[PDB]
Design a protein around this ligand. Structure first.
Ligand SMILES: Nc1ncnc2c1ncn2[C@@H]1O[C@H](COP(=O)(O)OP(=O)(O)O)[C@@H](O)[C@H]1O
Ligand SMILES: Nc1ncnc2c1ncn2[C@@H]1O[C@H](COP(=O)(O)OP(=O)(O)O)[C@@H](O)[C@H]1O
Ligand SMILES: [Mg+2]
Lengths: 469, 51, 500, 119, 146
């Protein structure tokens, strides 16, 4: 084994001196024996010369003396992959932090790997069926892209991630990978206890989503490497087993801020707005790995956070160039009577065209977006002039717009304890046929409350006939 | 009096709509000036510490 | 207080015998980091020369000081360690060019990434080539048909000119360049070599899934057989994306120097400026405005000056440049936006306000203009569209502030002309079909039709003019102009079809 | 300068543009050992611009009508290459970007263009 | 030339310091002009110095200090930016009866940029002098001169 000696220790940056010819390469994990800890991981950054290379520790460097033993692993930061990581809380170094024993994995893949080539990529953009009525018709998710989940606190961010992972595993057979990079201490414990009571993570049964711990209480090396550890476990299920995995990075703004902290402390000059110089290189190395290959795909549903409400910043404009879809969750609904608060006009996607979804799906999406945009802009005139001071065409369009806004908000399977209704999983063919019949005049005699908390064309006919009699 | 009150409602709605377009244009200029002030202040401290 | 070069490792080799291997061409890697490689040696290596590491990664020796040489790696930093043996190729940063590259997707160094095998190149041109002077240049006179009705009548493009494409995200920047390359199938599939134009799409800064989806759409419409694709995603190094503009200009320059037309599309110009500033910030340089170096304006002005029109003594070819500028909220007075507008002969502004209302593509008549687009256009389209650019800009300012008798005539004629000129995606028109639709909206033949029937009137007039009056449509495309007999026949056919 | 001193003729110097002389020296000042100034410029901005603008003046042997043009850096008159050249010109013709989009040909700003002969 | 034709150049000192010379000549123009006018105030006469302009003297001092391998301060200037202008203006004060009875008037002109008086060199000279004369560009174009 290649051994080394610690020469410098200034915070997270620790320089190790090796021998001639036995020096490690870039992005190499270095082992270090400590007291109560198992092994202190230290990723190699660059070589300063004279048989010395600067490394960044992924934990606390307190207590290290000048001349400690630093063993080299020979490769990068390996992590456990496969079906053994489902239901367990893993870390950035691939170790368990759930106190449930070690992850018995057959192989260990490194976190630093190249992405797919140009000949092994998907030549056509496919749509990903999520099961929701407001997501399969409006902003459709692309198979192998990035989706931004923008929303506030208490709007429905944690409930949307649990319902999408359970519907994809039952209709398509794909696992999930929640990589909470830059999260808080209280948010990590509440997310693990809520998933066990709904059926997503089973300790004795079968799990379907991976847990990757990554709080902000560690140093800069653990927060920046949290995105590579979570993406390596989701990419193994699509290349070896062939499944459409879904990666979650909560939040997306924590990945860009963690990369500039380790680069500024090593000697690199800043760029714009206090950002690192390799902003387009660090964000592109992790976003291109979650694409579509010949065996499977890897969707991304990160939560993009704008800096002080600014979309033209260096951390907002760099992540929006690779996002194919967007799941904007505004605060206008929520308590208004929509489950969940999904904006039909603010949530846009690049896969909502006539050459990717067909001519039938493009006509139904354009008709529902035009009726919702005209009713929202006419709300200021209806409150000052009443509802009876309109024409014949304006009165019929206003009555159909109220029922179409509540028909897309169906009750999820994991939210049955909050609303009392059963979980409805509408497919892509059932959601397009129900929206086209309401816009043609086939359901104009139905009530406005018959479409609320329902999904599909068969659920609207059974709820309208049972409401009166 | 009814014609003056009806004309005042149209002038108040036009003044409120024109103020929203000016606030949106001023917010884009304030966001670009805030990012440029952080880059100009950080470049002055990095130039004096490296000399 | 000390110095670099000879230090510890490099200071213990000159005391014995530093020979054996040739240090003039090869060299030992002393340090590597931040996309750089401090190789110890390279005495006979020239400036801006191609290098190669032990793992197969290419390099470019930028600075050549005494005892050391700064090599810029074009790949990942994990393929070069301390103590590796590098090697020089003997030449500068060149790439493959010739007529054998049509139909394959190449990268930044010229290697194929489509899996079609090797490229049959006819030569080797350098990426850093000087532009031509005023003696080997001529005026732009050839017409470049883009297919759009709002671009061929307002700000037209020509062979040898540089037309920019500024705008924000999701407005119509990349959609304007894709429609112009697919509309050249009517002239490239024939026998006229002077009317053909080889496309050159240089996707720099785009994602990996966006480059594969755009190449599949052009092959299904018979448009990828005579178009070069330069793949340059953001997942590679900073030296690969910055050199994508120089490598794509060297391959398209071979057709202009022999007797053919070329069309280069640098999508996008904003992504190339961010990749060049990342490598300059790591080499300890002075940052000017918007965290950019002092040579930011010289990198875009040198690559766009080579796309000019040659004279008759140089071959008669030309090279068209179509750079897309990505603005942040419509800020046209930025640092990278002012440098591209001061070097190109015209620009195409894409506003995000009119793009969300249905006006596709959103081309502002009061902002977009063409310098050498008046003389480099068709005579048939310019005669039917009399004062089309001046009437479009005046109708937009009067409609935003508005019922008089004079204002009602300009509002009805301006609304029908904007809806008829808005075409769909991948639906380009020829010069004979666009001259009959623009002559009816400017003469008052479309004022009696409704606003919602603007899309149905364009498809009915084009089909009736291709079976009942085929002699008028074929004369406008072959001759390119309309005399007294051609103008009288077009007015009688449009008036009889509008009443039925 | 030779046609106005050795021959005595009213020469007309037309520079386009005058802002390219200061921008070219800022990119090569970082490799010569000089530290950066304001907005990443050279430290000798007022010394280099004053040595070339003083020689293009009217002397006792002949006159020299200088008609140069300055370029605003991203539409900003408070830059180091635009504000330093305003103290070496008798007449200034500032072109605002807001008046060019309205229809003014050209965009002659009357509230910013000043001269010494306006008396 | 205008002062000599109106009988005013016979008792006025002209300190020529153009921008075409070195940075050390323009930066030392304020200290050299104050030494010649101080001889009349220490004998029994009155003097009036006019430092035109105060904005040009600050740019000349920062150019020579940046080339001598020194660390900069704010707005790419030296550390003692406020001490350079306050020391040259403090010497122009009215003496008492036991020193001769002379005085020295200082007229420093501050070149602003768009009426911004909240700058670095604008706020430093306004808090050292005993008053300031604001010259706005709005009333100067209408005809109200000065
Ligand atoms: N489909 C739904 N129907 C009714 N209520 C819902 C639904 N989805 C989410 N909610 C409510 O939204 C709240 C979200 O709480 P929490 O997860 O703490 O905040 P956030 O969603 O912002 O993370 C829950 O209290 C839940 O009652
Ligand atoms: N003529 C058109 N009709 C309808 N939609 C169009 C037309 N031209 C462009 N678009 C839409 O504009 C979008 C442009 O996307 P993209 O090229 O990624 O952004 P940008 O155009 O800003 O580069 C496309 O998704 C396309 O659907
Ligand atoms: Mg594009």
């Amino acid at each position: 084994p290649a051994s080394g000696k610690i020469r410098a220790v200034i915070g997270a940056v620790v320089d190790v001196q090796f021998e001639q010819g036995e020096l490690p390469a870039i992005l190499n994990a270095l082992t270090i024996d400590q007291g109560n800890n198992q092994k202190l991981v230290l990723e190699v950054a660059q070589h300063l010369g004279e048989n010395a290379v600067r490394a960044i520790a992924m934990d606390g460097t307190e207590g290290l003396v000048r001349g400690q033993t630093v063993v080299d692993t020979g490769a990068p930061i390996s992590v456990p992959v496969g079906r053994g990581t489902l239901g367990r809380i893993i870390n950035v170094v691939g170790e368990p932090i759930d106190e449930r024993g070690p992850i018995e994995c057959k192989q260990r893949n490194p976190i630093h790997a190249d992405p797919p080539s140009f000949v092994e990529q998907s030549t056509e953009a496919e749509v990903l069926e999520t099961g929701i009525k407001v997501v399969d018709l409006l902003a459709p998710y692309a198979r192998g892209g990035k989706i931004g989940l923008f929303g506030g606190a208490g709007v429905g961010k944690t409930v949307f991630i649990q319902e999408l992972i359970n519907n994809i595993a039952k209709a398509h057979g794909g696992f999930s990978v929640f990589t909470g990079v830059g999260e808080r201490t209280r948010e990590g414990n509440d997310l693990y206890r809520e998933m066990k009571e709904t059926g997503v993570i089973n300790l004795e049964g079968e799990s379907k989503v991976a847990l990757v711990f990554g709080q902000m209480n560690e140093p800069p090396g653990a927060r920046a490497r949290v995105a590579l550890t979570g993406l390596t476990i989701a990419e193994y299920f699509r290349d070896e087993e062939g499944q459409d995995v879904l990666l979650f990075v909560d939040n997306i703004f924590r990945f860009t801020q963690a990369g500039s902290e380790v680069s500024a402390l090593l000697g690199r000059i800043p760029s714009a707005v206090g950002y690192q110089p390799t902003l387009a290189t660090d964000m592109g190395l992790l976003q291109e790995r979650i694409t579509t290959t010949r065996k499977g795909s890897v969707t991304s549903v990160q939560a993009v956070y704008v800096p002080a409400d600014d979309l033209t910043d260096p951390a907002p404009a760099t992540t929006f160039a690779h996002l194919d879809a967007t799941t904007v969750l505004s605060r206008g609904i929520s308590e208004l009577g929509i489950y969940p608060a999904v904006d039909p006009l603010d949530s846009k996607s690049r896969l909502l065209d006539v050459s990717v979804v067909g001519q039938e799906h493009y006509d139904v999406a354009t008709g529902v977006q035009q009726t919702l945009q005209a009713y929202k802009s006419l709300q200021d005139i209806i409150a000052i002039l009443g509802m009876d001071e309109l024409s014949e065409q304006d009165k019929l369009t206003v009555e159909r717009a109220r029922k179409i806004q509540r028909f897309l908000s169906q009750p999820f399977a994991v939210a049955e304890v909050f609303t009392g209704i059963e979980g409805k999983l509408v497919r892509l063919k059932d959601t397009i046929a129900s929206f086209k019949a309401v816009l043609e005049g086939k359901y104009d005699h139905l009530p406005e409350n018959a479409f609320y908390m329902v999904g599909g064309i068969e659920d609207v006919v059974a709820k309208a006939e049972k409401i009166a009699a | 009096y009814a014609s003056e009150i009806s004309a005042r409602r149209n002038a108040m709605d036009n003044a409120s709509k024109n103020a929203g377009e000016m606030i949106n244009k001023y917010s884009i200029l304030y966001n670009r000036t805030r990012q440029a002030v952080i880059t100009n202040e950080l470049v002055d401290i990095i130039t004096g510490a490296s000399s | 207080k000390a110095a670099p070069t000879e230090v510890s490792s490099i200071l213990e080799s000159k005391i014995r015998v530093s020979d054996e291997a040739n240090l003039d061409e090869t060299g030992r890697v002393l340090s590597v980091g931040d996309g750089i490689a401090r190789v110890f040696g390279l005495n006979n290596c020239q400036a801006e020369e191609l290098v190669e590491f032990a793992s197969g990664v290419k390099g470019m020796a930028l600075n050549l000081e005494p005892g050391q040489v700064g090599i810029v790696l074009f790949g990942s930093d994990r393929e070069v360690k301390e103590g590796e043996i590098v090697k020089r190729t003997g030449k500068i940063v060149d790439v493959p060019i010739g007529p054998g590259m049509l139909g394959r997707v190449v990268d930044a160094l010229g290697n194929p990434i489509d899996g079609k095998g090797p490229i049959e190149a006819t030569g080797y041109a350098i990426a850093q080539l000087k532009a031509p002077g005023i003696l080997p240049r001529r005026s732009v006179f050839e017409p470049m048909q883009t297919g759009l009705k709002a671009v061929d009548a307002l700000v037209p493009i020509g062979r040898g000119q540089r037309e920019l494409i500024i705008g924000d995200r999701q407005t119509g920047k990349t959609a304007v360049a894709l429609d112009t390359i697919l509309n050249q199938k009517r002239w490239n599939d024939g026998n006229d070599e002077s009317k053909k134009l080889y496309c050159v799409y240089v996707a720099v800064g785009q994602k990996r899934s966006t480059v594969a989806q755009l190449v599949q759409t052009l092959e299904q419409n018979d448009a990828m057989k005579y178009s070069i694709v330069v793949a340059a995603t953001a997942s590679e190094a900073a030296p690969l994306q910055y050199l994508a503009p120089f490598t794509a200009c060297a391959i398209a320059e071979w057709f202009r120097d022999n007797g053919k037309h070329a069309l280069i599309v640098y999508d996008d110009l904003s992504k190339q400026a961010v990749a060049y500033r990342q490598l300059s910030l790591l080499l300890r340089r002075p940052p000017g405005r918007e965290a950019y170096p002092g040579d930011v304006f010289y990198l875009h002005s040198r690559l766009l000056e080579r796309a000019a029109k040659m004279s008759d003594a140089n071959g008669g070819g030309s090279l068209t440049a179509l750079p897309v500028i990505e603005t942040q909220g419509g800020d046209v007075s930025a640092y990278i936006p002012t440098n591209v507008i001061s070097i190109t002969d015209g620009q195409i502004f894409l506003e995000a306000e009119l793009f969300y209302k249905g006006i596709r593509p959103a081309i502002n008549v009061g902002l977009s203009v063409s310098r050498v687009g008046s003389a480099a256009q068709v005579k048939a389209m310019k005669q039917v569209a009399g004062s089309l650019k001046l009437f479009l800009a005046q109708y937009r300012e009067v409609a935003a502030f508005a019922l008089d008798a004079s204002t009602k005539q300009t509002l009805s004629r301006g609304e029908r002309l904007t809806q008829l000129l808005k075409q769909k995606q991948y639906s380009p028109q020829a010069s004979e079909e666009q001259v009959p639709v623009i002559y009816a909206g400017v003469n008052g033949f479309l004022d009696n039709i409704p606003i919602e029937r603007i899309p149905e009137f364009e498809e009915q007039f084009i089909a009736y003019l291709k079976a009942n009056e085929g002699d008028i449509l074929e004369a406008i495309r072959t001759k390119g102009e309309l005399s007294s007999e051609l103008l009288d026949k077009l007015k009688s056919a449009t008036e009889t079809f509008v009443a039925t």
